[PDB]
């Protein structure tokens, strides 16, 4: 029952600048030596975790020397001196002083970049789908930063609530931007009871909220 | 050079059983303690079990959530370790990794999904129109699906989104791409979808309506 606490769920960093990631244990991880039984891991997206640091402050082999780890008993710090894009992912601490071994919840490292407004697109439900019995209207927000974006569905100008779901990509490797999809689902019957379908997008990069829409006709 | 490779996951009924395997290459397994670790969105990374060496009488230790239900074992002459999972619970869903003693070597992980829901293959619908094109991959279970474009030749402006679970219990996923408006109606655009759990394979051209 050693609880490992990683206060920050995420941290944003300007490329080439430093970052510290903290972790706390409910109990001292100093084994009766000079040994502190603490691992640090990095999990890059879609990959297995990989060890950065063992015994609290020792770099594992092949780990770039811009990583370091430090700490005193119950509070631990992973440091990156100069963040590269190689380093984006989720950082976890883990104690193996006692069974059960326990992990922190992870701290996600996010790159900073200039504000970038989304390009917004709207896609009507396909005829092939309409024949099934339901209509999916899709709104795309392509390549934007920061992740904060407000998508507002309007059908015949009535604001929509409870019938849409969003999915966001991870920070893109090349440009450090995000992309988002918002899908509006309706029965074919209720979809054909309305004309104008609008996707309104609010974002720090936009001078004024942006709307992309269509009529069921054209 | 060391490689761990786990297999045996998939979709299984609550209360059912399943045995995972992990085979080591370029690695003299008999010399190392071995662990299983699992991952889910719900709980993050969870240590599951550990097995020591033959000369430790193969001593084992288990997570509390798993004691009495999972058995970790090893067969050094087959360069393998195993996790026998019985009375599977929905909470046991996740990606299962085998790892070495000091957590340097990890396998790629095998996905275990405990549910009473039956397999279902998805439907694929176009998202037609710089311009943006896409494919909508609706109503499938369980994860995962695979999406490519132009048989993998088109990789540049592609964004395939995380699946979202629907209120119906089925997943849906969109994959979209940006291409210039001057290729529409010419350079044919095709999305290739695989849902291996249902043996569903579907190709779909995307053309301006």
């Amino acid at each position: 029952d050693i609880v490992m606490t990683q206060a920050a769920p995420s941290v944003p960093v300007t490329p080439g600048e430093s970052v510290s990631i903290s972790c706390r244990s409910s109990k001292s991880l100093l084994h009766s030596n000079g040994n502190t039984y603490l691992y640090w891991f990095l999990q890059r997206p879609g990959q297995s975790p990989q060890l950065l640091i063992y015994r609290m402050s020792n770099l594992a082999s092949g780990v770039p020397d811009r990583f370091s780890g430090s700490g005193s008993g119950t509070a631990f710090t992973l440091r990156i001196s100069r963040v590269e894009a190689e380093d984006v992912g989720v950082y976890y601490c883990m104690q193996h002083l006692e069974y059960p071994f326990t992990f922190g919840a992870g701290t996600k490292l996010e790159l900073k970049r200039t504000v970038a407004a989304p390009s917004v697109f709207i896609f009507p439900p396909s005829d092939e789908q309409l024949k099934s019995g339901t209509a999916s209207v899709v709104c795309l927000l392509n390549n934007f930063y920061p992740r904060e974006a407000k998508v507002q569905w309007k059908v015949d100008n009535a604001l929509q609530s409870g019938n849409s779901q969003e999915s966001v990509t991870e920070q893109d490797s090349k440009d450090s931007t995000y992309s988002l999809s918002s899908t509006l689902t309706l029965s074919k019957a209720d979809y054909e009871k309305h004309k104008v379908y609008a996707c309104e997008v609010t974002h720090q990069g936009l001078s004024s909220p942006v709307t992309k829409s269509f009529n069921r006709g054209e | 050079e060391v490689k761990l490779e786990e297999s045996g996951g998939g979709l299984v009924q609550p209360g059912g059983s399943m045995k995972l395997s992990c085979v080591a290459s370029r690695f003299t397994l008999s010399k190392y303690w071995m662990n299983w670790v699992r991952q889910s969105p719900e709980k993050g990374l969870e240590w599951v079990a550990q097995i020591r060496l033959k000369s430790d009488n193969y001593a084992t230790h288990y997570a509390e959530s798993v004691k009495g239900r999972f058995t970790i074992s090893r067969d050094d002459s087959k360069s393998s370790v195993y996790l026998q999972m019985n009375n599977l619970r929905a909470e046991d869903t996740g990606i299962y990794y085998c790892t070495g003693e000091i957590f340097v070597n990890w396998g790629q992980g095998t996905l275990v999904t405990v549910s009473a829901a039956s397999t279902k293959g998805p439907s694929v619908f176009p998202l037609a129109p710089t311009a943006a094109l896409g494919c909508l991959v609706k109503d499938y279970f369980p994860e995962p699906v695979t999406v490519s474009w132009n048989s993998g030749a088109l990789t540049s402006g592609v964004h395939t989104f995380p699946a979202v679970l629907q209120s119906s219990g089925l997943y849906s996923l969109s994959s979209v791409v940006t291409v210039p408006s001057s290729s529409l109606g010419t350079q044919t655009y095709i999305c290739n979808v695989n849902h291996k759990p249902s043996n569903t394979k579907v190709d779909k051209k995307v053309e301006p309506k």
Binding site: H31, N33, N35, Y54, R55, S61 | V2, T28, K31, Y32, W33, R52, D56, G100, E101, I102, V104
Partner: peptide, 15 residues
């Protein structure tokens, strides 16, 4: 090689 084994042995301390 024996590097890895040497490392794991040096860190093992079951007592």
């Amino acid at each position: 090689d024996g590097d890895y084994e040497e490392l794991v042995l040096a860190l093992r301390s079951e007592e």
